[model samples]
Target chain A: VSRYVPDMGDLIWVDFDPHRPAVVLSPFMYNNKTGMCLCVPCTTQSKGYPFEVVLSGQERDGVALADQVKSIAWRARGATKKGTVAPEELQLIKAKINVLIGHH
Target chain B: VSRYVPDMGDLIWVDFDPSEQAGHRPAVVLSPFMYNNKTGMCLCVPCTTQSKGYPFEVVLSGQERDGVALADQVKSIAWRARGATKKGTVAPEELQLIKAKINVLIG
Candidate 1:
């Protein structure tokens, strides 16, 4: 079932910091295929704000020591009015997400 | 602000279960109105091994348990269906989330 996915920031609520060496959520693995997030962040750490603290995007950027983020959460309003996304759209999303991680 | 969300089984990636008390992920307050297995067996808990599991037909009948799901992770396949994310479509991030008991939450 290949359908249009909304936004990463919206669906997978994550907290990203551009400095971390391993910028990947240990628990949640966002499956671009199933539209489902594989539970790695949840099952591994289940206490206070376990899931949101991790995601692959956080590690892409330099993540300066001064970056102050209280918390990170993503909530998408859905998708384009065109209904599901297109292959190109997916590329754009992946690209944008890479950009969000501080890609130059 | 207002938009049409996809299958609840997809995006939420809901292990973000806030519980019915936090008054955060409250039912009806959120869309698809959520819930985490209350009365009987429905779509609240994990899909029944009997019924295989979700991504398939939901197990509408099963024993109602508190459910110990890991977490809910929603990922839209990059809006690749027809073309959703390309137009700069917001995919509208819903700032509000509900964790109601009577309805549903706890992905």
Candidate 2:
């Protein structure tokens, strides 16, 4: 019963980029044939810039890299229940993404 | 530009599982980093040697052994999928040219 439905702001691991962390930017998408979610992989690599915001709960090292967001096929590959991001953090990240993507 | 980067038409190897068991193959970078370049994700098109042609196939140089990029197979892959080349990229103009074809195909 591996029916873990990924939701907005869900934190799950993926093997595509090793053991690093990634964030869910889109709501859960159920295709029946395959499950998927849109996300922007996170990274601790930062230059102390304003564009890169530090994440809460964990270390201050994490910087939401909204510039390289993506939608990927969700599977059991390197996946786990890490938890979700804070509401405020989510909002901040969302605004940053909108600015970059030109949200009208 | 002192910073290293990946542009469109870039070719890199990813560890995506394929039937051939090759474990790694060439993938084309589709996104030109619309903004900053400090993220772990990228949009790409996985390639198969078979020529799909026209709006689908974008002929490429021997950046990784001459081949055509199947634009229809676009994917959003992370940095870890990238091969040991660190970060390989194709010519900018060539990648954008192909991207235009893909845009027409989709829109």
Candidate 3:
């Protein structure tokens, strides 16, 4: 069965070594066509890095590690949707990622 | 101040971008010190604490932290760049294992 494609800023549980939460960074067109999405893993424990964004809210209380952006086959791995972030939060995360990648 | 010379197995923060545009990320130096000194560039593989168990991903241990070195994404970078910072070194045995993986990928 095909899995649900994640949209940008959607939180999903990716099948990593221990199965961790990841924030989708890729838009719908990419995820829909390729079945893959760019993601930044979330961790409850903060490393206090400049590249990390602090996420707060129900089911979103964690730090987004922008430095560790990864392209994952979310559909093939059967990732489950968790929640979505606000547009403000998503923009913050994207800004931090751009800075981390030296796009500034 | 003298620039830090990176040795094999050394983990240093590099500013160069990869295929995915990696910037200011930790990388494992694969080239020897002599080669790095002569050319001012060193062969390296970017590392990520998040590993997905890919065949080209080699797990690294006994350093500041445990992470995976991506052999498939090997790059040659200028070590003298402003963003290069010496972080830590991996064991020689670990370095050799990663090199073996790189050889397999190249073959």
Q: For all candidates in order, state the fraction of native interface contacts they contain.
A: 0.02, 0.09, 0.00
Give lDDT: candidate 3, residue B4: 83
Provide DockQ values for all models, in the order shown: 0.03, 0.09, 0.02
lDDT of 1 by residue, A1-104 (tens): 75443332232323322111111121123334333322111122324421123222332311111111111122121222112223343333333322222211
Kindly indicate the candidate among 1 and 3 with the higher DockQ.
Answer: 1
Q: Record all residue pairs in model 3 with backbone atoms less than 3 Å apart, i.e. clashing.
A: none
B74 Cα displacement, candidate 3 (Å) = 14
Q: Candidate 1 overall Cα lDDT vs. reference? A: 0.22
Native-to-model Cα distance after best TM-score fit, residue B41 in candidate 2, in Å: 9.6
Ranking by DockQ: 2, 1, 3
RMSD of 2: 7.5
Candidate 1: where are CA atoms >4 Å away? A1-30, A36-61, A64-104, B1-65, B72-107
Docking class of 3: incorrect
lDDT of 3 by residue, B43-65 (tens): 67788888888676888876366
Clash pairs, model 2 backbone? B10-B90
Give me the runs in candidate 3 sitting further than 4 Å from their true place: B1-107
CA deviation > 4 Å runs, candidate 2: A29-34, A58-61, A76-78, B1-107
